[PDB]
Amino acid sequence: DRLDAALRFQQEALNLRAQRQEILAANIANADTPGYQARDIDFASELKKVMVGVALTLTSSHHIPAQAVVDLLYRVPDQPSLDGNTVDMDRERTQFADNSLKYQMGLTVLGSQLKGMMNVLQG
Amino acid sequence: MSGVLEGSNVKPVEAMTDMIANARRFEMQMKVITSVDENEGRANQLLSM
């Protein structure tokens, strides 16, 4: 559908921001686990990958339709801890706040596009 | 030598200096701990959007 193509980029950006938000909050929650590595995703490359499948064929009514079913990069440690935990509070707190801001911005842009498509139709 | 007993070799000057140094070091570490805790308390508000 053409409607999907217009809203594909912002939807994928919003979903990627939510996933990275979950990853950052997981990094915050597991700050005290000894031996836990701080993981993160490269937002731009994954957004390229998602932006850049074959529903199985249903011959009749009984035939069952096809059933549907990111890469994590390690953060470079800054300070060496003794328990092997590489999670840094300041870095991930700033990243968490930034991801929240960008999620809000994506919501704003997507809502503006939908509202414009709506006022085009209203009449 | 028979008829003499040897006592301990605890030097009291060294013990007193060690106690003074230990007390001062303990107070310095407690101050550092307080500073770090206060800094983290201030830093844990950024997460509010």
Curated annotation (Swiss-Prot), chain A:
Recorded GO CC terms: bacterial-type flagellum basal body, rod
Subcellular localization(s) per the UniProt record: Bacterial flagellum basal body
Major subcellular site: other
Superkingdom classification of source: Bacteria
Alphabetical list of InterPro entries matching this protein: Flag_bb_rod_N, Flagellar_basal_body_rod_CS, FlgB
Knockout-associated phenotype: Defects in flagellar assembly process.
GO biological process: bacterial-type flagellum-dependent cell motility
Alphabetized UniProt keyword annotations: Bacterial flagellum
Function summary: Structural component of flagellum, the bacterial motility apparatus. Part of the rod structure of flagellar basal body.
Record PANTHER family: FLAGELLAR BASAL BODY ROD PROTEIN FLGB (PTHR30435:SF12), FLAGELLAR PROTEIN (PTHR30435)
Subunit details: The basal body constitutes a major portion of the flagellar organelle and consists of a number of rings mounted on a central rod. In Gram-negative bacteria, at least four rings, L, P, S and M are present, whereas Gram-positive bacteria lack the L and P rings. The rod consists of about 26 subunits of FlgG in the distal portion, and FlgB, FlgC and FlgF build up the proximal portion of the rod with about 6 subunits each.
Protein family: Belongs to the flagella basal body rod proteins family.
Protein name, per record: Flagellar basal body rod protein FlgB
Organism: Salmonella typhimurium (strain LT2 / SGSC1412 / ATCC 700720)
Gene name for this UniProt entry: flgB
Curated annotation (Swiss-Prot), chain B:
Record-stated family: Belongs to the flagella basal body rod proteins family.
Superkingdom of this protein's organism: Bacteria
GN (gene name): flgF
Organism encoding this protein: Salmonella typhimurium (strain LT2 / SGSC1412 / ATCC 700720)
Protein name: Flagellar basal-body rod protein FlgF
Quaternary data: The basal body constitutes a major portion of the flagellar organelle and consists of five rings (E,L,P,S, and M) mounted on a central rod. The rod consists of about 26 subunits of FlgG in the distal portion, and FlgB, FlgC and FlgF are thought to build up the proximal portion of the rod with about 6 subunits each.
Coiled-coil regions listed: none
Location within or outside the cell: Bacterial flagellum basal body
Taxon lineage: Bacteria, Pseudomonadati, Pseudomonadota, Gammaproteobacteria, Enterobacterales
